[PDB]
Amino acid sequence: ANRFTSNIKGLTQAARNANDGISVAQTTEGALSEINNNLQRIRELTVQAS
Amino acid sequence: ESTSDPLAALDDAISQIDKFRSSLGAVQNRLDSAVTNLNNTTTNL
């Protein structure tokens, strides 16, 4: 029973950690999209200035 | 400075402290198994 409840608590905490990693990934992806917008604008500006 | 395998080195402690609790459990069982036949022997004598 003791090893059972140990494994159970560990799996719950691991699920929480995976959710936190998902949050980190979402934040970084938002930042990357924000950068990509400016990159596309610079691309259009270069096409104009060419 | 930190711990190499914390989860494993802590599961070892959990197992070591549970082995003693289990070994102490059978002691109660054998003690009561002795108490019953001891009372029977008292009555018979």
Curated annotation (Swiss-Prot), chain B:
The superkingdom listed in its UniProt entry is: Bacteria
Q: List the disulfide bonds.
A: none
- State where the protein is found: Secreted; Bacterial flagellum
Q: Write out the function statement from the record.
A: Flagellin is the subunit protein which polymerizes to form the filaments of bacterial flagella.
Q: Which family does it belong to?
A: Belongs to the bacterial flagellin family.
Name recorded for this polypeptide: Flagellin
* Organism, as annotated: Escherichia coli O127:H6 (strain E2348/69 / EPEC)
